[PDB]
Symmetry: D2
Subunit: 440 residues, 4 copies
């Protein structure tokens, strides 16, 4: 599953529909990023630029011009064909091929952007520009507008109104098309396969980074070359560090390992967390905490649907957590009083859910305290966890346990679809999977 | 093999030895780098900062103060301990532990750098600073010097002399210690294991990126988590693109694949290229070009030694290439006349060798046309290649063949040591390796 | 005559009337400007900031908030009272006194602008800001908007629309109130007195700068402390340099001197040019050129009125010039053909008229080729000139003559009012004035 | 008196003498400065650039190249000849005429600086550059050095050492040549004539700014077109504001007026303060404070000589002030105890003396607490004052009196020469001067 030329074109047209007549929208590619000295990180296109183009080159700018309410057209600035540069660094689309390949009306050399952009903006009323997104883009836009402002004797005029297109575009991205959901479904499947592999490979004595290696290899073999975020493999006390990425420790017999990892497939993020015993068998203490986190996730998966909110479901999870922690002696007191005091916060200190899409922490307005009412087409994670610090003032068998269990879901008319249920999470199913692997 | 605290300390002392009395040297950590939105690439420390510290955190500055010819001391600025930040993002060394851990005299919070740096520079004659390396560092240094310049009524004075420490430091890095050579030797071994695995796994129908996945997994399993540069897997015509990293094509029965890949192990780069038949058997045309590139590499490996130069060895390779290309009818004319015309350049358009170390294209002065006389302790690649474009005006059986064969060597008293000879390169040995794998 | 608090308030309200509901307009003071080292030029407030405040301090920002269509208010950020700073550098209005003095609702310390501005912009739909006017202002505004954009978890939101208020404000400034016209009338009178004095003082042997001194002293004695632009005193060949300000030469018996000078009175510019003989008597050649420029000015003064344009009047002047130059043998050919070829351009190479107000080259849209139809309340200069270069291919008696004659006018319902006719310009009247002075 | 081409050349050679072999010094002109919109302040050349050139154009850079210990040469970058630009804005020296006019070896167009500067710096060991002086200059220098650093394959190398030439140059400026002293002597005479005129013109009812007008006219008529700093005319309570420049009040019968004003003559500053009665007659209270300030100045003028310091002379002034203030009942207690408590500070809160030269607050190291030992050739002001605030807790007849009396001196072998004693300061002489004027 992928997103096709015609869908990128539909998206551009949907933005044009929202624009004022006599306007232009400017969407800039990501800069290349140095890793060290003259070496660069693998290129990651800007998510918004990608959303409107599917074009993976730097030094490119998409310009959508809405001349009036019926007439509009698109211009791409992009790197010119250059034999020497291409022999060295890779093929370039160039100007001749771009209109057909991408479905834009005109293509111009990026090297000419300063000579041409002001001409495209001249006489318009509004420019849509994400000011502050990139320094290089602000320089280009500000230079064009200055030329126009100062150019009255050459009959030039600048648009006086500049509108940030991010809010409009991010609201578009918040609601996925069926084709996007298909891509996210495949991302979920690839990511789940990777997590299953990690559980089947894990043995005491392996290092945390070895599971990262298994995961990344599995992503790759399905055509997801890069993770959507840096893989977390936190064993023992490291599982209490939410974004632990050192992944440097030897995994010990008797510890849990928490793996939070997701692929990037056709631009879209998977995002799964599974926690499991390094030696294949939960201890009683580990199982007691695990059961609370799993009940939280299972209840959330039952509840999420159009018309509820992340805030509402979070309230249900908090009750499950406080109730469970009271039963184990980790919290002491009346459950409702403890809930009123947010007594769970030392142990569950992050949000339950975030949007998912072209970014792992995807764009889109959450509302105050994540109260926005859910509607079909929204995609989000569901990620309860409990983290009992090594020095917590709790019964000592619970100290140093960090557990998170996370699935990705899409809100549907009828509830939600779980995109990542193909990797096990019930403790008996985890143990059975690991027992079978450990016998091989 | 690794580099230890005491070696980082020796390096700092060796820099201090070269500094003027009444001076300070400022070495800044790399900034964290955005991948997309709020997600960052995996952190890569600045190579020079790493060289003097082995410290892998951002927001850190090493200050070496040479008060006079006998007295000197070191101050590290680094992130403070912070419970919330560490629960979220990872452990921090902090100030209390840093002096013992890193072997520096004093540690201060990075948040106090603007309040403290000018005090350390006050009254000194010289500041050593890599101006232009990082914007954030230039802002900090310029602000400190401005405070001092403008502070005469507070009895402050700025050093009037600013010296770029890069030339001195880069000359230090050019000559490896035995411990560095041991780390590079292990990097070479890990990288060679990865290339052997790729040859044993490659089959027609696999995608280029699948070999990247095999390679990266092999790096990981030996504790080299990240490549030293973006892996190149160029099959067929893609092998004629020198830094081809799209790695997107299905590898065809009858094509060669060129793999240029290297690990990063304890900061140091491996860098190997091997080219081999996708189907396990060189065609006659492929073998004819391969033999020329291999003779070039084998001759270079015989020649490299103290007292010669990259330029001198390149001359020998050019003769081998022109002679071989004349024999095949790719070039026509008198060999010496063709050499005088640089007639090989359409087919071999890059350098034979680059320095290798903490960067894959390592630091250090090459001399005009890479004429610097080689001495023991220098580490470099040896990478002849021939690239016959699909539209080259040559006998048609050679079109679209790209071959490079690259090893990493250290110059020794007695010649060179080849760090990467544990992956095969003779064509009969490649074929035998692949035949054995293909039967499994 | 001056502009009063109540008029500044009316102007602010007139801007608020044009603003969208749920918006804020930000108008920033001018920075102080270094002359050399720690010394600054005399402060000149930004004309737009002045227009809305009459406040002559730096480090001040006017914020007009239109909460909805009935409710609006104003906030000034300005320097705090500070005993030491005021003992040294001058009194400050401060926060307590500002609301009453300036007629604004609230005043806050400029030192708190970054802590407070984002709070004023939070939740608004539109911000009016002159982007690119001042770097320091762009930094403040961009920082506030970034805080709001990144502050969703603190329930902050940024206005997505930014509108340049310059076009609206500059159209306001283009049409003067009766009180503004009264101030400009006084500026015209002061400037005319200064030009009369210069004619009465001028003698062969004085330096050009001596007339500048007379002019500036006369401005000062009427309470116009500063010129509106750098005074031009171009004698002989220097009169052919349009903005000649060196004013360094000894004025010679037999040369003309061209003086272009204007005062700044309560912020508003006068702008007069007079050309006259250094020795009190025009030569025949000087009179011949002078008569053409004077006819051009006199005809323009008859013509300017509502419903014509600068372009239309310029056409009449060009005909007068070409006709006159043909009669003298400076141009050769058919008058209408010469007009069609713009044959006057080597001798009259600037515009006839510019707007006049808080800036000498005042703000406001001219239309293509200065074709905008004139309406009552517009104020403009009328400044024909002829400049015959020392090396011009013309009869030799005309070489090195530069003549410009310029008056300031206001367009009225009934034609125009000449604000600067109190300094003579008819050649016989100039000669009589100078003869009378020279006898004293 | 002026500074000539040969002296500017001597200064350049004296700097070259101090430079390391294999170096270049870069000295940049001042930017032009906006006053409002498209109008600029009158140009003021950078004092250091002026010191080495006497060249009054922007867009100019002096490059002094010391190739080795015997060979050196100079290159000027400056604006090209341009007929249109010169017709509009003034004559330009250009490249052809500059070598002879200024005494430099070569001149190049400023528009070519980026194409040429790196070529001049290539292969040098040291660049002398005033980093942070001007943004535009730092951009040019940093760009050149970056080209060289990155240009090893083009055989380019950057100087690794950058030295601020300000300390060396400012120490040169601190010691005046006889020709400089002659120019400062004329500046002192012009400034004194202006102050005498102000005393002779002052009448109750005139505004403070009227005396500014008289002063500026007198500067002008002697060929000092511009003041060296903004003129202070503080009458009554305004005399207690040290840099009062509003100059807006009507001067009252019974008040003093304090005038601090100085011309700029051939680049050099005069700087005189005189305080005198608006009505020509000191009151008893005014005379009592005046006598203390005058004794302070007269004693300082007796004492200043080689081998003392500003700090030492200040101690003598403090004793005079405390003793005088005790006698009047403004201070109460034991004189030596009061001196130990710095009890004079509420009334004398500034320094006695500053260096004088191309800047009014001239360059040069003062030493801690202005303790540097004076030597012949140093030029400085001597400016005691007493300022009794309107709300001071002192006998009420002294409230609101601000008095400063300031002369300019040069340290000689034999003591000092007073450059400004031609304007009176003894109270009986002030009164006699004003009585004579008031009778006319
Ligand atoms: Cl391009
Ligand atoms: Cl910190
Ligand atoms: Cl403030
Ligand atoms: Cl130029
Ligand atoms: Mn996750
Ligand atoms: Mn997540
Ligand atoms: Mn390689
Ligand atoms: Mn290489
Ligand atoms: Mn004018
Ligand atoms: Mn004008
Ligand atoms: Mn003074
Ligand atoms: Mn002074």
């Amino acid at each position: 599953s992928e997103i096709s030329r015609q869908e990128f074109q539909r998206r551009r047209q949907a933005l044009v529909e929202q624009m004022q007549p006599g306007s232009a929208a400017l969407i800039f590619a990501a800069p290349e990023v140095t890793r060290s000295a003259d070496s660069e990180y693998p290129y990651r296109q800007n998510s918004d630029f990608w959303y409107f183009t599917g074009f993976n080159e730097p030094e490119a700018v998409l310009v959508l011009i809405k001349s009036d309410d019926t007439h509009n057209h698109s211009v791409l600035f992009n790197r010119v064909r250059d034999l020497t540069a291409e022999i060295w660094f890779g093929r370039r689309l160039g100007q001749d091929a771009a209109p057909e390949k991408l479905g834009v009306d005109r293509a111009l050399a990026f090297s000419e952007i300063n000579q041409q952009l002001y001409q495209l903006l001249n006489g318009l009323d509004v420019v849509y520009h994400a000011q502050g997104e990139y320094a290089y883009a602000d320089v280009i836009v500000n230079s064009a507008l200055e030329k126009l402002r100062k150019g009255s004797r050459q009959n030039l005029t600048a648009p006086a109104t500049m509108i940030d297109w991010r809010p409009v575009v991010h609201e578009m991205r918040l609601f996925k098309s069926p084709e996007e959901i298909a891509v996210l479904r495949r991302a979920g499947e690839i990511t789940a396969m990777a997590h299953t592999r990690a559980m089947e490979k894990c043995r005491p004595g392996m290092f945390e980074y070895h599971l990262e290696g298994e995961i990344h290899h599995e992503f790759n073999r399905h055509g997801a070359r890069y993770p959507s975020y840096n893989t977390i493999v936190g064993s023992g006390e490291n599982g209490c560090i939410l974004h632990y990425t050192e992944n440097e420790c030897e995994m010990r017999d008797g510890d849990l390992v928490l793996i939070d990892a997701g692929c990037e497939y056709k631009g879209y993020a998977g995002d799964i967390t599974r926690t499991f015993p390094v030696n294949g068998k939960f201890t009683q203490a580990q199982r007691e905490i695990y059961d609370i986190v799993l009940e939280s996730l299972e209840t959330s998966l039952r509840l999420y649907r159009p018309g509820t909110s992340i805030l509402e479901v979070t309230g249900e999870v908090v009750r499950i957590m406080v109730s469970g922690l009271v039963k184990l002696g980790i919290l002491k007191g009346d459950v409702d009083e403890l809930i009123a005091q947010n007594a769970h916060r030392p142990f569950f200190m992050h949000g339950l859910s975030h949007w998912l899409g072209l970014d792992v922490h995807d764009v889109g307005v959450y509302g105050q305290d994540r109260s926005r009412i859910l509607e079909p087409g929204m995609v989000l994670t569901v990620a309860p966890g409990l983290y009992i610090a090594p020095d917590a003032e709790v019964p000592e068998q619970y100290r140093g346990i960090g557990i998170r269990i996370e699935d990705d879901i899409v809100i549907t008319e009828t509830g939600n679809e779980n995109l990542t249920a193909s990797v096990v999470k019930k403790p008996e199913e985890i143990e059975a999977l690991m027992v079978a692997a450990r016998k091989q």
